[PDB]
Design a protein around this ligand. Structure first.
Ligand SMILES: COc1ccc(C[C@H]2NC[C@H](O)[C@H]2OC(C)=O)cc1
Ligand SMILES: [Cl-]
Ligand SMILES: [Cl-]
Ligand SMILES: [K+]
Ligand SMILES: [Mg+2]
Ligand SMILES: [Mg+2]
Ligand SMILES: [Mg+2]
Ligand SMILES: [Mg+2]
Ligand SMILES: [Mg+2]
Ligand SMILES: [Mg+2]
Ligand SMILES: [Mg+2]
Ligand SMILES: [Mg+2]
Ligand SMILES: [Mg+2]
Ligand SMILES: [Mg+2]
Ligand SMILES: [Mg+2]
Ligand SMILES: [Mg+2]
Ligand SMILES: [Mg+2]
Ligand SMILES: [Mg+2]
Ligand SMILES: [Mg+2]
Ligand SMILES: [Mg+2]
Ligand SMILES: [Mg+2]
Ligand SMILES: [Mg+2]
Ligand SMILES: [Mg+2]
Ligand SMILES: [Mg+2]
Ligand SMILES: [Mg+2]
Ligand SMILES: [Mg+2]
Ligand code: NA
Ligand code: NA
Ligand code: NA
Ligand code: NA
Ligand code: NA
Ligand code: NA
Ligand code: NA
Ligand code: NA
Ligand code: NA
Ligand code: NA
Ligand code: NA
Ligand code: NA
Ligand code: NA
Ligand code: NA
Ligand code: NA
Ligand code: NA
Ligand code: NA
Ligand SMILES: [Sr+2]
Ligand SMILES: [Sr+2]
Ligand SMILES: [Sr+2]
Ligand SMILES: [Sr+2]
Ligand SMILES: [Sr+2]
Ligand SMILES: [Sr+2]
Ligand SMILES: [Sr+2]
Ligand SMILES: [Sr+2]
Ligand SMILES: [Sr+2]
Ligand SMILES: [Sr+2]
Ligand SMILES: [Sr+2]
Ligand SMILES: [Sr+2]
Ligand SMILES: [Sr+2]
Ligand SMILES: [Sr+2]
Ligand SMILES: [Sr+2]
Ligand SMILES: [Sr+2]
Ligand SMILES: [Sr+2]
Ligand SMILES: [Sr+2]
Ligand SMILES: [Sr+2]
Ligand SMILES: [Sr+2]
Ligand SMILES: [Sr+2]
Ligand SMILES: [Sr+2]
Ligand SMILES: [Sr+2]
Ligand SMILES: [Sr+2]
Ligand SMILES: [Sr+2]
Ligand SMILES: [Sr+2]
Ligand SMILES: [Sr+2]
Ligand SMILES: [Sr+2]
Ligand SMILES: [Sr+2]
Ligand SMILES: [Sr+2]
Ligand SMILES: [Sr+2]
Ligand SMILES: [Sr+2]
Ligand SMILES: [Sr+2]
Ligand SMILES: [Sr+2]
Ligand SMILES: [Sr+2]
Lengths: 132, 53, 337
RNA sequence: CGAGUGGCUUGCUACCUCGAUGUCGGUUCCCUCCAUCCUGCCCGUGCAGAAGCGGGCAAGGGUGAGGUUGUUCGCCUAUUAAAGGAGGUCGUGAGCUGGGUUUAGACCGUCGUGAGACAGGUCGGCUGCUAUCUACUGGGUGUGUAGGUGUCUGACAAGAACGACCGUAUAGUACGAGAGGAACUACGGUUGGUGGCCACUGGUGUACCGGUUGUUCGAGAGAGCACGUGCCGGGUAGCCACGCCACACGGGGUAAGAGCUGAACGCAUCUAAGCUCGAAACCCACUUGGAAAAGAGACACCGCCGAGGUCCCGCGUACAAGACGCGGUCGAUAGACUCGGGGUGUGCGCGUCGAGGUAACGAGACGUUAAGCCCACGAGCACUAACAGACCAA
RNA sequence: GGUCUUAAGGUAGCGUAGUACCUUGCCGCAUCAGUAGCGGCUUGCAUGAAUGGAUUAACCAGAGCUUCACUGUCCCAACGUUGGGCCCGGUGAACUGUACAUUCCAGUGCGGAGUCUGGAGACACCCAGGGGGAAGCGAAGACCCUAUGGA
RNA sequence: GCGAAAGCCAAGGCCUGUCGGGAGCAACCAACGUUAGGGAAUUCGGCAAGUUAGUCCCGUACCUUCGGAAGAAGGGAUGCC
RNA sequence: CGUGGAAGUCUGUUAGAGUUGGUGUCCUACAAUACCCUCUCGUGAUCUAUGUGUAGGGGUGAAAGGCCCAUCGAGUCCGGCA
C-alpha cells in the first residue's frame, strides 16, 4: 500500500474487541484478519493504525450483528511515531466499516481520525469531522 | 512548542501527543506530566510546574 | 503437520567468540575509481543525540520538510599515518614486501610500538618501485594510528594502530600520493577522506555481555505455558535427534555473546565538524564532554562509549550521495532525565 | 493391458532385543529429501487481454493464525505470494506435557449360572538419576613451529543475510466490439528473517524522593517491623523491545529453454566439433572465523645484558575461574570535595490563618522554601590512594 | 405374519444417553469458524420401571459447556528481588567401572558399531554449559507365550 | 479487631531450624515483584496466576420440598479534625 | 413486631481433624510417603489421650480385597527344609 508517513506499533491482534467509529448500526467490532499480512510461527496476527482489517460485528443492531465485513483502523491506544519524532496516541481503539471500493458503509464518522489514515483512505477522510 | 500540562518548552524530537475522546489534543513533554494528569491532578496545584510558578 | 519457522539466529557471524583485536580489521576495501586517497579513518564512540534535518531525498514526498533523525556522536580527531606498506602478488596470495617509515613520531607512540631509530626510507622505496616495474605490486596500504591523548574522555593514551588501504588512479600516482602523506608527518583529518552526506561503513567490536543463554544469544523461545513451571524456563527442547548421534554446531547453545567484530554497512554521515555543538548537558553518560573534531553518524554504531570505531567509504551503497544535509537543529538536552 | 521406482500406509515373516532400547498425539531445537504449494527462469494452450489450465528446470528462501476433536488424520473460518508433502529409532520423555492407549477404584450397555469378559463407552488414577566417556557451544593452560613489539597474509571454514508482498508513475495505456485490462522500467512502503544500538517512545529500576495505614521507641522530631519494598504515587543510570539504525547492484559459468554457425546426410538440422544467450538455483561479490595451514606463514622496527613480559598497585570499553583492556606522579585510574547535569515535589522549626471550643486543644491552609532529601553520570580538582618493591627473559 | 421359540413380547416414561455401532446422525441455538455444549427429532447396533423408571429444590475440592470480570497462559519477552549456581578455607560421600577408548561419514556384521572395512578428521591437558550418543545409569519384563509352576 | 484472626510489641526464651569467606554476584535453576498495547489468541482443560474482598445502606431474578435460592445480581457509603 | 435460640445449619488456618489442585519443591530426600501454597470439615454418624477387647483361613472392615507394627487376594517368627 501507500506509505502512511508514520511508524506504527500495531496495538491490536486477531480477536481484539474495538469500537466502530460510525453510524452503520455496528457498535463493537472483533478483528478476524489483517489485509496483506503473513506472520510467523506462534505469533498472533497484529493490526494497527492505517490497516485494512477483516472484522465481525459483536455488538449492535440485529441485522448488523454476526456479519463479516471489512474495516479500516482509524484510532489506537498504542503510540505511533510521526516524522518529527513526536508520538501520537488515542483514547480508544477504533475502526470504520468499509466496502469493496474502500468507501465507508455509513454516512457519519464518530470521534477523531489520524491524518495518516485520511491520506491513505480518501473517502474516509471526506467524512471525518476531526483530523488530528 | 510548549507542554499543555507543566508549561516548559518541549525539546523538539521528543514528547507524546494525547488525543482525547472529543478530539481535543494534549502535547506532553514527558511521562511524569502524563502520569500526574492521569491522577486527576491539575498543573497549577503542583509547585514544580511552570504554570504554577 | 508442525509449522515451518526460520532457524534461531544467523549462522554467518560465527563462531560467536571473543574478538582477537579490539581494534576492528576490515576484510574488504572500496574500488579504485577517482583520485588517489586513503580508504578509511577512525574515531572514538561518544554517545547519542538527535538532529532535526531537511529531507534531501528527491523521491520522498517530504522533500524540504523538517525530519528528526537519531545520531551517534563519534569523536574523530586527526590521525597519523606513520608508514607505507606495499604488497606483492605471489602464487600464495598477497604478502607484505617492505615498509617506508618516518622521523616524526607522536610523543606517546612508544606505549604500543618499538619506535624506529634506524631505518632506510629510500631502500624501501626503491624495493617497492622495482616491484612496480616488474608488475608484481599488489596493493598500497598505510600503517596508521590514533591520538587518544587528543580525546579527554578516553582514559587511554596508548594509540590504536591499524592498516588502511590507498585506492585511486594509477598505481604509480597513488604510490606517490601515499609517500607524500607519510613524508610530512602523516597528519590527516576526517575531512581529507570524507564529506558530510556520504555513506560510510562503520566497523566495531560490540558491547560485551559475557556468557548468556540461547534466548538472548540466539533468540530462542522461552518454555511456554505449563512447560515454564516444570523446572525448565530458558533451556531449549533438545540438543538434536537420536540420529546423528552427536550435537551439531548449528544448535543454539550458551556461550560468549557480545565483544564480536561487526561491519555495519551504509551509515550516512550527517555532519563532520569541530567544537562543542553536539555535546549533551551534564556530559554524555559514562563518557564525558565533547569539544573537538567530531562526526555525526546516522543511527546506531557498534560498541560502547569510549570504543574505537573504524570508518571506510561504502563498498556497497544503495543510494546516490546527497551531499551536505541542512542541519537545522542538534539537541543538547541532558541524556539523564 | 503391460513395465517399473519408492519404502510414507497396510499386510506378511519371526532375523535382532523379553537379567527392559519407556507409548500415541502435542511441543521445543537441529539437519535433510524432491515426487515443487509459492517465489525465479521457461515450453504448450481449446495462448487477444486479464485470469487460468498443463508441462519443464529448480530445494535459495518461504509455506503462517485460528474453531470442534487427546487425536495423527480430517472438517471448518478468516487471512496469504503460498498457506506442499516426506526422512532423521513413525528425529526429539538422562527436554517438556500426560489429553488418548494400557494396572489397581467405579458406573452403563452387551455377554456369562458365576467368578468375570469386551479390539464397547465413561469419571478418577505417579513421570527416578549428583555426566565417567563421547559430541557440540563458549572459556583457559601448555607444548610444537624456534628473543620481542606492532601490523598483516589466507589455506580452509560459516551465512539466507537476505526472502516475499503491497502501492504509485507507466496507464484506464497495449490488447479487446465491449466488458475488462497488462508489461519493461523508476520509485515509496509493508512483512518475515538477520546483525547492532538506546538520542526518541515504552518496560524495569526491593538506587532514590514523596504520600499513607497498623504497631513499637512517651508526644514531637526521627525511626524499626508488616518477606525478603507494608501499601500507594513518581522515577535517574544501566539493561532492554513494544523503540531506533543497517542488510545491493553487478560480474562469471550453467539447467530448462531461445538461438547462431555447421557436418555427418550436397539439402535440412540449436549439436556431433565450435558459439551467442539464459533461473530466486552454482561461483565471485559482501559479512564472520581463521598461523597448529607439520610447506606450522609474511613485513617493519626493537633487542640478545638486555627489548619485551610477569608480579604488584588504581580501575574497567572486559569478565563465572582463567582470559581481555586501561592508568600508575613525565599521572586525572579510583575515592573525598565543589560545581554541572539529573530524581522527587516544597523539609525541621517559627509566624499568620483555621471549623469550633471558656479554656485547654485543634485536622488542616499559607509563608519562609524551584524548598528539604537523593544520584550507579560529567567537569574541576593531586587532598587521599595508584606507594614500595620483586621476578623472568634470547 | 395379517402365530413361532422358550412363559410373556416392552406398558409410564426416558432416549444419539457416562447406554447409539453406524456417527462429527438430521434440524436449531452459539461462534468468523464449535467431532464440544444445550434444545428438538429419535426406527433404541444393544433404553425402561426397587437388576427400580422418570423427575427434582437444596448440597458438592465430582464430569462437560457458555457469558461478564481479570490477568505475562499466550503474542514476546524484559528488568528486578532473595537463595543457589562461580571463585577461596574447612568438611567430605554415592551411583558406576570386561578391556581398550580423540572421533566423524559410509559400509559390513545376529538385520540398531567409539573398537570390524574404506575413507575423512584428529597436538596434549583443564574450566563452565545444556544433556545428542554410549540402543547411558537404575530393576533376572509388569505385556505375550511357555512350565504336566504357585496362589 | 468480631475474634484464642492478621500485623506490631511485652514478660520469658533465643541468635543452635548451627559451616564460613569472595565476585553488581555471568549462563542456568528455585521462590518471587513489576511489565506497554492486546486480553485465553495459551492449553486436553484458564493448569498457574490473577480478579473480588471487611462493614453499613439501598436493592435482589428463575426455580423451590416454602426451609431455601441469597452475601443472588446490581448500586452507594467508608479517613481525619 | 418482638422474644426465643433450634440445626449430622452457614462463614471461619480458634483449637483440632482431613487431604483437592499445583501433576510445584524433593526424588543417592530433612523424610523407606517429607516441604510449601491452595483446598475440605470444624456441636457432631465430630476430634482426641489413656486403659481395655477381637488373632491368622482367623479378626476388623460406612466394602477400597481396606487394615491387623515400613509385612496382606491370607501377618510375623522358627520349624517341616538341604
Ligand atoms: C508401544 O508399545 C511398546 C512395546 C514395547 C516397548 C518396550 C520394548 N521396545 C524395545 C524393546 O523390545 C523393549 O524395550 C524395553 C522393554 O525397554 C515399548 C513400547
Ligand atoms: Cl488471520
Ligand atoms: Cl515449551
Ligand atoms: K524386550
Ligand atoms: Mg503453535
Ligand atoms: Mg535516558
Ligand atoms: Mg525526557
Ligand atoms: Mg534411550
Ligand atoms: Mg523434478
Ligand atoms: Mg535447504
Ligand atoms: Mg517417535
Ligand atoms: Mg532424549
Ligand atoms: Mg523420563
Ligand atoms: Mg536427570
Ligand atoms: Mg479424559
Ligand atoms: Mg481417563
Ligand atoms: Mg442430540
Ligand atoms: Mg417389576
Ligand atoms: Mg526375566
Ligand atoms: Mg496377565
Ligand atoms: Mg492353581
Ligand atoms: Mg501487560
Ligand atoms: Mg492451539
Ligand atoms: Mg486456579
Ligand atoms: Mg484404643
Ligand atoms: Mg476389585
Ligand atoms: Na525439575
Ligand atoms: Na531415546
Ligand atoms: Na519396489
Ligand atoms: Na511425541
Ligand atoms: Na526451494
Ligand atoms: Na484443527
Ligand atoms: Na525408539
Ligand atoms: Na512423548
Ligand atoms: Na517423563
Ligand atoms: Na547469470
Ligand atoms: Na432389560
Ligand atoms: Na512474571
Ligand atoms: Na548426553
Ligand atoms: Na417467632
Ligand atoms: Na495437600
Ligand atoms: Na464433603
Ligand atoms: Na494365615
Ligand atoms: Sr585490515
Ligand atoms: Sr578475510
Ligand atoms: Sr513435572
Ligand atoms: Sr548411531
Ligand atoms: Sr532433483
Ligand atoms: Sr510456480
Ligand atoms: Sr499415525
Ligand atoms: Sr475421521
Ligand atoms: Sr516429526
Ligand atoms: Sr494420563
Ligand atoms: Sr475413543
Ligand atoms: Sr463358560
Ligand atoms: Sr476399552
Ligand atoms: Sr613433539
Ligand atoms: Sr499497477
Ligand atoms: Sr472500467
Ligand atoms: Sr523492610
Ligand atoms: Sr488491598
Ligand atoms: Sr542448450
Ligand atoms: Sr606459527
Ligand atoms: Sr413403545
Ligand atoms: Sr550439568
Ligand atoms: Sr524480650
Ligand atoms: Sr557446629
Ligand atoms: Sr514501579
Ligand atoms: Sr479458551
Ligand atoms: Sr483454543
Ligand atoms: Sr458493592
Ligand atoms: Sr457445622
Ligand atoms: Sr467451615
Ligand atoms: Sr493429578
Ligand atoms: Sr527442597
Ligand atoms: Sr515422593
Ligand atoms: Sr504455586
Ligand atoms: Sr527351611
Amino acid at each position: 500500500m501507500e506509505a502512511l508517513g508514520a511508524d506504527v506499533t500495531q496495538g491490536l491482534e486477531k480477536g481484539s474487541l474495538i469500537t466502530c467509529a460510525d453510524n452503520t448500526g455496528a457498535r463493537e467490532l472483533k478483528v478476524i484478519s489483517v489485509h496483506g499480512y503473513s506472520g510467523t510461527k506462534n505469533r498472533h496476527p497484529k493490526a494497527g493504525l492505517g490497516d485494512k482489517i477483516t472484522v465481525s460485528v459483536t455488538k449492535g443492531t440485529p441485522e448488523m450483528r454476526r456479519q463479516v465485513l471489512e474495516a479500516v483502523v482509524v484510532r489506537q491506544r498504542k503510540p505511533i511515531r510521526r516524522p518529527d519524532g513526536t508520538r501520537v496516541k488515542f483514547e480508544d481503539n477504533a475502526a470504520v466499516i468499509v466496502d469493496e471500493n474502500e468507501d465507508p458503509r455509513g454516512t457519519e464518522l464518530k470521534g477523531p481520525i489520524a491524518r495518516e489514515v485520511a491520506q491513505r483512505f480518501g473517502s474516509v477522510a471526506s467524512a471525518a469531522t476531526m483530523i488530528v | 512548542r510548549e507542554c499543555d500540562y507543566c508549561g516548559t518548552d518541549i525539546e523538539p524530537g521528543t514528547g507524546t501527543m494525547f488525543v482525547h475522546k472529543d478530539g481535543a489534543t494534549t502535547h506532553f513533554c514527558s511521562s511524569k506530566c502524563e502520569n500526574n494528569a492521569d491522577l486527576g491532578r491539575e498543573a497549577r496545584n503542583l509547585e514544580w510546574t511552570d504554570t504554577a510558578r | 503437520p508442525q509449522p515451518s519457522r526460520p532457524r534461531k539466529g544467523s549462522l554467518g557471524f560465527g563462531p560467536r567468540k571473543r574478538s582477537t583485536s579490539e581494534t576492528p580489521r576490515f576484510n574488504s576495501w572500496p574500488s579504485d575509481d577517482g583520485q588517489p586517497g586513503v580508504q578509511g579513518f577512525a574515531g572514538y564512540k561518544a554517545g547519542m543525540t538527535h538532529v532535526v534535518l531537511v529531507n534531501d531525498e528527491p523521491n520522498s514526498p517530504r522533500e524540504g520538510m523538517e525530519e528528526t533523525v537519531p545520531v551517534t556522536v563519534i569523536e574523530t580527531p586527526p590521525m597519523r599515518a606513520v608508514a607505507l606498506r606495499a604488497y606483492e602478488d605471489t602464487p600464495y596470495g598477497q604478502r607484505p614486501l617492505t615498509e617506508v617509515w618516518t622521523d616524526e613520531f607522536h610523543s606517546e607512540l612508544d606505549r604500543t610500538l618499538d619506535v624506529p631509530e634506524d631505518h632506510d626510507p629510500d631502500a624501501a622505496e626503491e624495493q617497492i618501485r622495482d616491484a612496480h616495474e616488474a608488475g608484481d605490486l599488489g596493493d598500497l596500504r598505510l600503517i596508521t594510528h590514533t591520538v587518544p591523548d587528543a580525546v579527554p574522555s578516553v582514559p587511554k593514551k596508548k594509540p590504536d594502530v591499524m592498516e588502511t588501504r590507498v585506492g585511486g588512479g594509477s598505481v604509480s600516482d597513488r604510490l606517490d600520493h601515499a609517500l607524500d602523506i607519510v613524508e610530512d608527518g602523516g597528519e590527516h583529518a576526517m575531512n581529507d577522506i570524507f564529506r558530510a552526506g556520504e555513506y560510510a561503513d562503520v566497523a566495531g567490536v560490540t558491547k560485551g555481555k559475557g556468557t548468556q543463554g540461547p534466548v538472548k544469544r540466539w533468540g530462542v523461545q522461552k518454555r511456554k505455558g505449563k512447560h515454564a513451571r516444570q523446572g525448565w524456563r530458558r533451556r531449549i527442547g533438545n540438543l538434536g535427534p537420536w540420529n546423528p548421534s552427536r550435537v551439531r554446531s548449528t544448535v543454539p547453545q550458551q556461550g560468549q555473546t557480545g565483544y564480536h567484530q561487526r561491519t555495519e554497512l551504509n551509515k550516512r554521515l550527517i555532519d563532520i565538524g569541530e567544537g562543542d555543538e553536539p555535546t549533551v548537558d551534564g556530559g554524555f553518560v559514562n563518557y564525558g564532554e565533547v569539544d573537538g573534531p567530531y562526526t555525526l553518524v546516522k543511527g546506531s554504531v557498534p560498541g560502547p562509549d569510549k570504543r574505537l570505531v573504524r570508518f571506510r567509504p561504502a563498498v556497497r551503497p544503495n543510494d546516490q550521495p546527497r551531499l551536505d544535509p541542512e542541519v537545522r537543529y542538534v539537541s543538547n538536552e541532558s541524556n539523564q532525565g
